[PDB]
Amino acid sequence: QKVNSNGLRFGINKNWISRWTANSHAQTAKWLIEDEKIRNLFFVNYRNAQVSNVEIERTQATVDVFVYAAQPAFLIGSENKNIQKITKQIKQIIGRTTNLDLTINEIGSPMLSARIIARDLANAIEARVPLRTAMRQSLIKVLKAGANGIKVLVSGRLNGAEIARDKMYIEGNMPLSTLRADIDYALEKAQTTYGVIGVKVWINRGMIYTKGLNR
């Protein structure tokens, strides 16, 4: 039960992270197998630069990438060591028959995405730190960031075989049935030393009023 409201909140209310179209739907398998591999490259490898989203756009045997992070240094580095390596990886995952270009962008107020929130909470909990202090500092950080009401939930163990002692906090407004909230959702799987931990983050980022179409 409690069907997730994130997936219901895409398409006519948010913007697709992957925009693409091609000819007759036979290579859709190929283009998909490609582009989610590029997408998961960042989510698997780089968990220290606080990358918010990666926009892949492909159209008529073309491809162009927008990457939005919080620390451009980790994706650039001294002597441009990072850009060449990521370019080599993308070349390895893209083939030698199509174009390849991208731009490095830094976006202000990067904390608006719950994905990096979940990543930071996973880093904190997997740092041999008591959960209480870490998540208290996390909620302090998300409230000082100017965001609206917040809600978090932790599952799995606390290195103890029980799920009857987990904690969720409710702050601010959380209307999910209200189709104007622009509420962001994220989740992360942190492998603790005793099992699997699922951390889920709901954040409210202001209600879009006087609007009837997506933008």
Residue 52's CB is within 10 A of a number of other CB atoms, namely: 17
Q: Which of residues 4-33 bind RNA (CB under 7 A)?
A: 4, 12
Closest CA to 124 of 115, 135, 116, 114: 135
In this complex, which beta carbon is closest to RNA, that of residue 38 or of residue 187? 187
CB of 107 to RNA, least distance (A): 27
Closest CA to 113 of 210, 45, 204: 204
Q: Which of residues 31-50 bind RNA (CB under 7 A)?
A: none
Q: Confirm if 130 and 158 have CB atoms less than 8 A apart.
A: no
| Angle at 88 (CA atoms; ends 86, 94), nearest 5 degrees | 100
When asked if residue 3 is in the footprint of RNA (CB under 7 A), the reply is: yes
Q: Confirm if 132 and 62 have CB atoms less than 8 A apart.
A: no
Q: How many residues bind RNA (CB under 7 A)?
A: 31
When asked if residue 195 is in the footprint of RNA (CB under 7 A), the reply is: yes
Which positions ≥6 away from 99 have C-beta within 8 Å? 62, 63, 64
In this complex, which beta carbon is closest to RNA, that of residue 100 or of residue 131? 131
Question: Which of 51, 200, 203, 205 is the binder for RNA (CB under 7 A)?
Answer: 200
Encoded one letter per residue, x for contact with RNA by CB under 7 A and - for no contact, window 155-174 reads xxx---xxx------x-xxx
- Would you tell me which residues interact with RNA (CB under 7 A)? 1, 3-4, 12, 149, 153, 155-157, 161-163, 170, 172-180, 187, 189, 194-198, 200, 212
